[PDB]
Design a protein around this nucleic acid. Structure first.
Lengths: 1040, 38, 114, 49
RNA sequence: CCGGCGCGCG
């Protein structure tokens, strides 16, 4: 990535390859040579013989029939029978290792999965100081190991150092130092203040310090807080070593690196353990820093972080996989020994440990997520996320408020705009376009080096880690400035030590020259982004991820030039793997032949995503065309000519129109409807499973009792809906009988469409019955409608509220009616001026037959660079096409338009143009819900929750407050008793309303109060409701 | 104390009170900041 | 398993001498280029396309002038990009083309002159 | 609707004297940085200004 | 028809 934008999946690609090379070998080691208690039978692995074989199932087959794309592991083992003194070595089977796709995603059970990166505090020593209740400064040094073990060194009020381990367990330094054997004599000499340590030496501690073992026992007493005197034993040290030394004393390669720096130590790199000198050296700075010597450690600095890729997550699970295998073998070797048998090495090892722990890692781990396949943009941005959450990371409630903020070390590594919305704001990041993961878990970005005359400097592009980022003067300006002096004395803005300066060019070390350096993919697809407020940039990035691929796609007139990068790295288009010539093309395949190698590339035709969006590919080449390796062969969904195409170019005006664009409503024309401009295909999947019950297995048949032939009209003989049938709401999909009650699969509400794919498949198993699975895929052609959501690339979103005939829309001076009308009041409050630039230039490009791919921040060349570009291109289109309304000298970009209802011009000129508008997933037909009555919960007896469950709407406490504010005491009682949970009164309301005979008061308690009474009874508490008559003062006990 | 520290600086660290020839601006900055801010 | 991305091979002066001396059945196209030359990128892409077109019916090679500067000067190279079309028949004479000539011009030269 | 207020690029009106005032502030910031480099003002005086 | 985890919308 020194001279080009790197592949967006290159971090996933390189991480997985690192795991294959070094992760397997480094983890196949550490596998103990398993020996029995008697030492008779020794089982061991020959790690140098490890191998992986290519998967037997093809990657298309793995997802087609719900399998996992993985490869076999076939290491060899040697079992030693010292009874016979004979060796047997066989190629045993260890498990299956999942394989990453070239796109960077795994397949488990036929589900695409993505492993996202995690951010957590880097190992080393960290210095912090926190005020106490009285404001007295208290300094602290904290050791962080390779597994998150924190060893806190604290200075108390009496200057006594305590090696705090938990919230209560407190241990002095001298006991801890003498626990490992640091004699009390040498502790004093190696520090500048021997007096401080000696002042805290009570006569009780000195005796325990004098001998190595007494310090260990006292250290155990203070660490464990267990009454009594422990006995020194080998097991006690091992028990302590696993709990304390194994988790709090192994720094690792990274942990040693930082400690050598922060504590200024010349210790060899190979020492991956916390040397005892470091603790004593740390105490020197800790006490020394109290007297103004040094600076505190910045915990939010990126130089104190690490990034864990798929390489670290897959290797760690292999650490659990093989540790899970040894426990399997130990039980297996002990079992076979008790039978005095000779077991073959294959039978001592089963494939369950590796296969299951990887099967359950993608299923359950939060950092393993389902790939979002809404559009090509979502496929690539999902894999580039950085999260502080996950195991070992802070939770949203746990997260500090100083975190979630932008740190100066993020520049070029973490996008300052892209973040999640909600409680997880500032905790889910996103990598920049040019960001790279280094060899220490640190993020790097490339900078251009400016050096003196006498220097070779073969490559001047060097990637900079955040630790060395501060100590360089990095400029972002240009050298287009000259006065009567020389160029080196001209001043430019620069960054140095986490601040912004203004210094001369001769003092600049590095330059930031890449245009997309500081942004993620989402923010890098916004043209004229420098004219939009950064608040809307975050919203705009999210909306582009919700765009629906349209049945027909077209390229944007105005773009940034990153659309071609997105298309290439998404895998949606077909990319040649071999040079040659095109010989045959059609819908189902493309045939390419080159260098005596003839290949056949199939094309995806109307496939379904995880978000119910259609996938489809069309050829982009013709027969007889020469192709280079890596050039495009076909276009996929939301891709035209090798570019990302998420929307359409439509004629647009910015004016208020009779309140139908009030707030954020959008007025559109019928041309967008009958022209199929925003028509999208949506495919749902309906699955039914056959289970074996006590009465017998479920049966599938066309003959279903108590059903009409009209409902079953689309079924075949087997009992499944026919391929290519127009189903309806309530129609039958799979007829199934459970012994026999009808348990068939019916089409839900609003699911009417055309059946396009049926999959009657049996999962072969070891039982006498195999689970049968049926998958029905139904396509739905959705044209744009009132209530649909459209948005532009500048955070300008809106709901369609009105559709007009073309003769009613306002029209231009060439007579063409516009397609959309936007409210002009949405610009000043939202402060996104870049949409005004894009619409004017989109109009110019359509008349000039031009497309524009403009890199952001074009004002680095000159002032008002975007204005000069748009105005000059508007005038060129006006002059060439003889359309004087396209560029108006009086008011450039605006023109007088006419009312389609009266033919009279609107008084003020209107900004018109041809912007790029997207259609989003959030639309009606997926949000309209209604309920009369129906199914209730089993315990609370309240109506269910959810549109899919035909549930009701919740009247929460804030809604109850409003009803109490109005004083509507009878509306409130309805929503509390006989519309929610009063079982007796719900059935009477259903009866009276059908006869219209007045509803009486419930007067009894609802099932939610009776539920509470029983629970209070379970705590030996009785809650009785009494009514005292105002007539005769008789106490009446209410039934509850 | 601030009589033996100066002697130690002179002897061990080469300190000497060399004359600083100042511009009017630097002289004014030294003479005026000894009184206060504004 | 992975095909190479580039079909045009880079040769030394000695290797090119041996190639020209030896028996040749297909036309030989020699490219002189330098990585610091801006026009040589487009010529490189055009020659990759040409090599794709002529699978085994032509031989496309390239010589870097930063490694064979004296050899390029001997061969009467006055600038970059420069192409030499060498016919398989030793009796015929080679053709030197200077500039970013079109791909169709290369095809015409190869078809009707080599 | 009848008036049809809109919003163009040249409707966003900067006051005529911005360029005069930005240049004045740039000239004062250039002078102080030279004299801060001369040691005639200290860092806080430059940071405040 | 039960709870956790992850992702989203207003």
């Amino acid at each position: 990535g020194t001279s080009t934008i790197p592949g967006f999946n290159q971090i996933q690609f390189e991480g997985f390859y690192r795991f294959i090379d070094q992760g397997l070998i480094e983890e196949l080691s550490k596998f103990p040579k398993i020996e029995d208690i008697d030492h008779e039978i020794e089982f061991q692995l020959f790690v140098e013989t490890y191998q992986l074989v290519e998967p037997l199932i093809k990657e298309r087959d793995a997802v087609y029939e719900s399998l996992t794309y993985s490869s076999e592991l076939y290491v060899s083992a040697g079992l030693i029978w010292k009874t016979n003194r004979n060796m047997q070595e066989q190629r045993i089977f260890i498990g299956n290792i999942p394989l990453m796709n070239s796109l960077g995603t795994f397949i488990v059970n036929g589900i695409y999965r993505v492993v996202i990166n995690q951010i957590l505090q880097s190992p080393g020593i960290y210095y912090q100081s926190e005020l106490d209740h009285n404001g007295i400064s208290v300094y602290t040094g904290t050791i962080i190991s390779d597994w998150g073990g924190r060893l806190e060194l604290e200075i108390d009020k009496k200057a006594r150092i305590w090696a705090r381990v938990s919230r209560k367990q407190k241990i002095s330094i001298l006991v801890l130092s003498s626990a490992m054997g640091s004699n009390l004599r040498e502790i004093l000499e190696n520090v500048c203040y021997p007096e401080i340590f000696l002042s805290f030496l009570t006569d009780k501690e000195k005796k325990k310090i004098g001998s190595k073992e007494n310090a260990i026992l006292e250290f155990y007493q203070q660490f464990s807080c267990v009454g009594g005197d422990p006995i020194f034993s080998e097991s006690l040290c091992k028990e302590l070593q696993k709990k304390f030394f194994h988790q709090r004393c192994e720094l690792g390669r990274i942990g040693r690196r930082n400690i050598n720096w922060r504590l200024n130590l010349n210790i060899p790199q190979n020492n991956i353990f916390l040397l005892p000198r470091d603790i004593l050296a740390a105490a020197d700075h800790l006490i020394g820093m109290k007297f103004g010597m040094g600076t505190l450690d910045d915990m939010n600095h990126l130089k104190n972080k690490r990034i864990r890729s798929v390489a670290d997550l897959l290797q760690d699970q292999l650490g659990l996989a093989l540790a899970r295998l040894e426990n399997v073998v130990k039980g297996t070797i002990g079992g076979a020994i008790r039978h005095k048998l000779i077991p073959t090495p294959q039978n001592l090892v089963t494939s369950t440990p590796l296969t299951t722990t990887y099967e359950s890692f993608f299923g359950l781990h939060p950092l393993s997520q389902v790939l979002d396949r809404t559009n090509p943009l979502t496929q690539i941005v999902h894999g580039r996320k950085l999260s502080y959450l996950g195991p070992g990371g802070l939770t949203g409630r746990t997260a500090n408020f100083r975190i979630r903020d932008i740190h100066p070390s993020h520049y070029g590594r973490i996008c300052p705009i892209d973040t999640s919305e909600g409680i997880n704001v500032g905790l889910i990041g996103s990598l920049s376009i040019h960001a790279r993961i280094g060899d220490w878990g640190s993020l790097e970005s490339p900078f251009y080096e400016l050096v003196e005359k006498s220097k070779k400097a073969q490559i001047r592009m060097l990637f900079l880690s955040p630790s060395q980022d501060e100590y360089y003067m990095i400029a972002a300006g240009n050298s287009l400035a000259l006065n009567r002096g020389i160029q080196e004395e001209q001043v430019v803005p620069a960054r140095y030590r986490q601040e912004f300066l203004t210094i001369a060019w001769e003092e600049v070390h590095l330059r930031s020259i890449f245009p997309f350096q500081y942004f993620s993919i989402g923010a890098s697809l916004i043209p004229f982004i420098e004219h939009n407020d950064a608040n809307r940039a975050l919203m705009s990035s999210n909306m582009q991820r919700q765009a629906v691929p349209l049945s027909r796609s077209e390229k944007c007139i105005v773009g940034t030039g990153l659309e071609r990068q997105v298309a290439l790295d998404s895998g949606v288009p077909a990319i040649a793997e071999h040079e040659g010539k095109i010989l045959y093309t059609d819908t189902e395949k493309i045939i390419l032949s080159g260098n005596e190698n003839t290949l056949s590339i199939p094309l995806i035709m109307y496939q379904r995503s995880n978000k119910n969006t259609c996938m489809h590919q069309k050829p982009q080449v013709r027969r007889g065309k020469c192709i280079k390796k890596g050039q495009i062969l076909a276009d996929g969904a939301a891709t035209v000519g090798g570019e990302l195409a998420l929307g359409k170019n439509v004629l647009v005006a910015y004016m208020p129109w009779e309140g139908y664009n009030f707030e954020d409503a959008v007025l559109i024309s019928e041309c967008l409807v009958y022209g199929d401009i925003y028509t999208s295909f949506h495919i749902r999947k309906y699955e039914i499973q056959t289970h074996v019950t006590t009465q017998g297995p479920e049966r599938i048949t066309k003959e279903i009792p108590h059903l009409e032939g009209r409902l079953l009209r689309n079924l075949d003989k087997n009992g499944i809906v026919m391929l290519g049938s127009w189903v309806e709401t309530g129609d039958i999909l799979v007829g199934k009988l459970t012994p026999s009650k009808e348990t068939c699969l019916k089409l839900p509400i609003g699911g009417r469409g055309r059946v396009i794919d049926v999959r009657w498949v049996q999962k072969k198993g070891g039982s006498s019955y195999n689970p049968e699975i049926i998958r029905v895929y139904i396509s739905q052609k959705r044209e744009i409608k009132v209530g649909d959501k459209v948005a532009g690339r500048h955070g300008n979103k809106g709901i369609i509220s009105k559709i007009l005939p073309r003769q009613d829309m306002p029209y231009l001076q060439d007579g063409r009616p516009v397609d959309m009308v936007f409210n002009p009041l949405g610009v000043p409050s939202r402060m996104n001026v870049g949409q005004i630039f894009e619409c004017s230039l989109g109009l110019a490009g359509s008349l000039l037959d031009r497309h524009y791919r403009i890199a952001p921040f074009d004002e680095r060349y000159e002032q008002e660079a975007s204005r000069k570009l748009v105005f000059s291109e508007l005038y060129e289109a006006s002059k060439q096409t003889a359309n004087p309304w396209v560029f108006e000298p009086e008011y450039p970009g605006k023109s007088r338009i006419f009312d389609g209802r009266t033919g009279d011009p609107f008084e003020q000129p209107v900004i018109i143009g041809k912007p790029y508008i997207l259609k989003l997933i959030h639309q009606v037909d997926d949000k309209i819900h209604g309920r009369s009555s129906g199914h209730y919960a089993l315990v609370t007896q309240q109506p269910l929750r959810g549109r899919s469950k035909q549930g009701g709407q919740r009247v929460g406490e804030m809604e109850v407050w409003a009803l109490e504010g109005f004083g509507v005491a009878h509306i409130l009682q309805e929503m509390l008793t006989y519309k929610s949970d009063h079982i007796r009164a719900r059935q009477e309301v259903l009866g009276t309303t059908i006869i219209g005979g007045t509803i009486p008061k419930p007067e009894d308690a609802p099932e939610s109060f009776r539920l509470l009474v029983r629970e209070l009874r379970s705590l030996a508490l009785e809650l009785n409701h009494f009514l005292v008559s105002e007539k005769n003062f008789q106490i009446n006990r209410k039934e509850v | 104390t601030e009589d033996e520290a100066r002697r130690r600086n002179w002897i061990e660290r080469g300190w000497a009170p060399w004359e600083e020839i100042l511009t009017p601006e630097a002289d004014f900055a030294r003479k005026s900041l000894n009184e206060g801010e504004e | 398993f992975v095909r190479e991305d580039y079909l045009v091979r880079k040769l030394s002066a000695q290797e090119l001498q041996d190639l020209v001396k030896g028996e040749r059945k297909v036309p030989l196209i020699v490219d002189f280029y330098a990585t610091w030359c801006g026009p040589c990128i487009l010529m490189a892409q055009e020659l990759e396309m040409l090599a794709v077109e002529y699978e085994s019916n032509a031989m496309i090679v390239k010589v870097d002038t930063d490694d064979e500067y004296e050899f390029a000067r001997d061969m009467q190279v006055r600038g970059l990009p420069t192409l030499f079309f060498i016919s398989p028949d030793p009796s015929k004479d080679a053709i030197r083309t200077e500039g970013l000539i079109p791909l169709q011009m290369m095809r015409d030269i190869i078809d009707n002159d080599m | 609707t009848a008036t049809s207020i809109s919003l163009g690029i040249d409707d966003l009106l900067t006051i005529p004297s911005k360029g005069w005032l930005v240049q004045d502030a740039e000239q004062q910031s250039l002078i102080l940085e030279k004299h801060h480099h001369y040691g005639n003002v200290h860092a806080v005086e430059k940071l405040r200004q």
